[PDB]
Amino acid sequence: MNPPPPETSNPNKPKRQTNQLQYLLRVVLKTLWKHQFAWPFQQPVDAVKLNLPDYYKIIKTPMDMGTIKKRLENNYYWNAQECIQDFNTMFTNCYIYNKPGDDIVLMAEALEKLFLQKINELPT
Numbered sequence: 404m405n406p407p408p409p410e411t412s413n414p415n416k417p418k419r420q421t422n423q424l425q426y427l428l429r430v431v432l433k434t435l436w437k438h439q440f441a442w443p444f445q446q447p448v449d450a451v452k453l454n455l456p457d458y459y460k461i462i463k464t465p466m467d468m469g470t471i472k473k474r475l476e477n478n479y480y481w482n483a484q485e486c487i488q489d490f491n492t493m494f495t496n497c498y499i500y501n502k503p504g505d506d507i508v509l510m511a512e513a514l515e516k517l518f519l520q521k522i523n524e525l526p527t
């Protein structure tokens with residue numbers, strides 16, 4: 404089975420809006436979402452549909468851009484670092500599960516390069 408997806412809305416977790424988190428949603432998430440290579444990263448890895456029975460034995464901190472979109476939209480994060488950590492966790496999961504030069508890794512690396520370029524322009 405797949406696990407349930409990561410939590411995206413927590414009534415008990417405090418919320419706030421910052422210009423960095425607005426940038427992470429309206430610039431960073433939006434730009435990566437529209438990238439040609441984004442499709443494997445737009446939702447949790449469906450290990451059932453993809454026949455990857457070891458995926459969630461190896462990856463115990465799953466992350467994906469559909470979850471990050473929901474966390475941003477729901478004001479789930481208190482600070483930008485929490486959202487940047489989620490993007491980094493998602494790329495790292497892909498790297499750990501696969502091998503250098505695999506198609507999925509080249510795709511993740513291109514998205515990560517674009518992510519880092521956008522993060523360099525994160526406002527104050």
Ligand SMILES: Cc1cc(C)cc(Nc2nccc(-c3c(-c4ccc(Br)cc4)ncn3C3CCNCC3)n2)c1
Binds near residue numbers: 442443466493496501
């Ligand atoms: C035929 C084919 C070929 C390719 C390149 C992609 C897909 N679709 C697809 N969808 C979702 C997840 C993956 C995937 C990930 C992965 C993606 C996001 C995160 Br976060 C973490 C890991 N790691 C490997 N894979 C594939 C690699 C090739 N087949 C076995 C599974 N792949 C399908």
